Amino acid sequence: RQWYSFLASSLVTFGSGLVVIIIYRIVLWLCGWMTEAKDWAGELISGQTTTGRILVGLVFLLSIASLIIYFIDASTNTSVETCLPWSSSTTQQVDLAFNVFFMIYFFIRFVAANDKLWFWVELFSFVDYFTIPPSFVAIYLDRNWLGLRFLQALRLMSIPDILTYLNVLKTSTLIRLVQLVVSFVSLWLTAAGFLHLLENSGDPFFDFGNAQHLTYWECLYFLMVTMSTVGFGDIFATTVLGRTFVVIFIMIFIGLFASFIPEIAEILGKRQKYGGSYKKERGKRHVVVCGYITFDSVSNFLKDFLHKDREDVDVEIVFLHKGLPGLELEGLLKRHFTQVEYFWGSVMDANDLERVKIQEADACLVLANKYCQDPDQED
Amino acid sequence: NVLKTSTLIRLVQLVVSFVSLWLTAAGFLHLLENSGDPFFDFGNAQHLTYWECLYFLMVTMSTVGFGDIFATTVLGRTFVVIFIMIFIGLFASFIPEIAEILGKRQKYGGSYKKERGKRHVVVCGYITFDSVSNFLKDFLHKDREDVDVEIVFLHKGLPGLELEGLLKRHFTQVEYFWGSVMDANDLERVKIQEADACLVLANKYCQDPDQEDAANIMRVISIKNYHSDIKVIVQLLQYHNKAYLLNIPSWDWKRGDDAVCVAELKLGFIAQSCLAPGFSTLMANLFTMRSYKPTPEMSQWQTDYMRGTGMEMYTEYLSSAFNALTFPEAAELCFSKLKLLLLAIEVRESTLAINPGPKVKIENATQGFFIAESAEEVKRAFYYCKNCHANVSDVRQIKKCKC
Ligand SMILES: [K+]
């Protein structure tokens, strides 16, 4: 019915701002407090001031809140355009409040930006043009359009920066993890929104006659079923715009999914198994063992050390070495689990010595790699 | 001759060969299904559009395989079998190779933009999260004066993730660029003619410090060749290398150029300890920014020692109230009234003098050298007034005098 008025609000706001920048650039080409404002705004969005850390916390929360409002509106609706007076639609009211906050944040970024022209073409500036002006048209008429609002899922891509500005991503692997997860999820969610718009709206060059009423969730499922190349065909696109989007999506997202899953599996596979600390039993003796620890040296040692013809002395053996134990050693450790323990670490670190409670060990044994390339270096 | 570059040649061969093969294969399948099987007298046929075939071949190249569309002529199905065997290898090699080529572009290209009258310092050589954090922790230290200098890193590598985080945290005043000071275009990119100074950093842990110092000499040669009047400060891992850069035609320590020879300094510091046992620790603490930060588990000697570490050396102009005192009275006055340890002065050419004897008068606008807990402390020596402040026993009250 009237959806093009919502779309036009984003285009006139984009275009008029771009024209104002271009004529100003040309006037200044043909022919202080500005810098103080830029620096202050820069410090603010960087979370360098405490009010900046507050603003960053609000950008983080209100992105998620807006996205949930989009999921609600996308889930509990039929036609993409929908007639409804604004005073009755509670989600459309809190959506306006969030769009006002994001408009203020957009101008704060604009002040902070070093080039205004490139800033007017940065991805989040498009998210803002395609969301805030439509949210005002949604007051000026007794109706709404579930149009480009799905682009709110891209605001999640700010989260790794926020969790850097709030200095909580302290470690390189954890930084890489949160970039991977958030970029993958935000791309998957936004792509599902775009396909949901295309199929429910139908082909414009067939006067919207060719259309298909998917839920957002069916699109979200279907994009996972295609990213993975599983391809059931229980759900499939049938608008020409839908099918052309699926072709583009396949070319892009197979590379994403097929690189993302292994890199997540490597990162979640990296955690050390034999962490933790030894627990001291009541009056029971233990001997710490370190240096060249291997299935060979440990079996040669334990065969004599735990030999059945010794007296029944209740000493526990506590290995301490930097490596992950090899499978033959893991078997040997499980066979002797009652009285033998292993820990990742080195006797060169006072924390690892505390982990094995070496102050309360009966003795410590240091073993040499007899077959090393330089016995002076090994000693 | 427009494909001027090997990667761009490879890109256009990949894209065009893939697209032309995909389009022509879609045409062949479109012919087969719409024509039907000839050995069934064309009775078995299926009216696909070209676009449905084009879509269906992408859905099969990718192995997605919906089965919303599928071939049903025997010639169609046999063509789909051949197409699968051929084009899975094409698609599965094409997509990664495009992703590598489009992934190759340099992030930190472009050029620094000079703000109105704002100072910047170019930094180059061994740039890493370690060396940059060790540097910036002292260089941007909160206990320094609020000086608006911007730091502009210039190095060949892409920055590691920890460094990208550090650069984003300091985004307001720290910048990074891909390049090398060995190239006059990169020196222009960072506008080094208009930089306040340039710092050259050494990899202290390199496999040959003679080779690392040779590389750093080159740099200084390249920087000075591009513009002679840049203040250059260079780190040297060896003393014997210094003599080479002393021979550079526009190297000028009277102009403020300098070499931080860590070997010369190290051995000087520990040699003074042979004259006065703990002096290397006394002196090393004066030359690093360090805040005093007690915690109640510290022993007496630790709380004392750490108060000592809370010092740095600072420089400030003496107020006119010091004029024509001897250095002895100026030191007595600083210590007793201002709670400042004056130890040396700039004497008019002009030269530094340490603890100079009674014969040396203080003169107007003498720079003094002080030990103190902050730059905020030494200010008292600039504001002091021999009428207006002479009995201000609450020393923190000293400010701009009426007298
Ligand atoms: K499949």
Numbering used by the authors:
A (entry chain D): 14 to 44, 79 to 426
B (entry chain A): 214 to 561, 567 to 621
The authors write:
The large-conductance calcium- and voltage-activated K+ channel (BK) plays a fundamental role in establishing negative feedback loops to control the firing patterns of neurons, transmitter release, insulin secretion, and smooth muscle contraction. BK channels comprise four identical α subunits (Slo1)2,3 with seven transmembrane segments (TMD) and a large C-terminal cytosolic domain (CTD). A voltage sensing domain (VSD, segments S0–S4) and a pore-gate domain (segments S5–S6) reside in the membrane. Additionally, two homologous regulators of the conductance of K+ domains (RCK) in each subunit (RCK1 and RCK2) assemble as a tetrameric gating ring (4× CTD) and serve as the cytoplasmic Ca2+ sensor.
Mutant R2Q also led to active-like VSD structures, regardless of Ca2+ binding. However, R2Q VSD lacks direct coupling between S4 and S2 at residue R2-D142 as seen in the active VSD structures of R2Q and WT. Neutralization of either R2 or D142 resulted in the loss of a voltage-dependent S4-S2 coupling and reflected an increase in the activation energy to open the channel. Under apo conditions, the distance between residues N161 and E388 seen in the R1Q (4.3 Å) and R2Q (4.7 Å) variants is equivalent to the distance in the WT Mg2+ (4.3 Å between N161-E388) bound structure. In mutant R2Q, we expected to find a configuration in which the VSDs are active, but the channel is closed since this mutation impairs the coupling to the pore. In the R1Q (apo and Ca2+-bound), R2Q (apo and Ca2+-bound), and R3Q Ca2+-bound structures the S6 gate adopts an open conformation. The resolutions attained for each mutant were as follows: for R1Q, 2.7 Å in apo and 2.9 Å in Ca2+-bound conditions; for R2Q, 3.4 Å in apo and 2.9 Å in Ca2+-bound conditions; and for R3Q, 3.6 Å in apo and 2.6 Å in Ca2+-bound conditions.
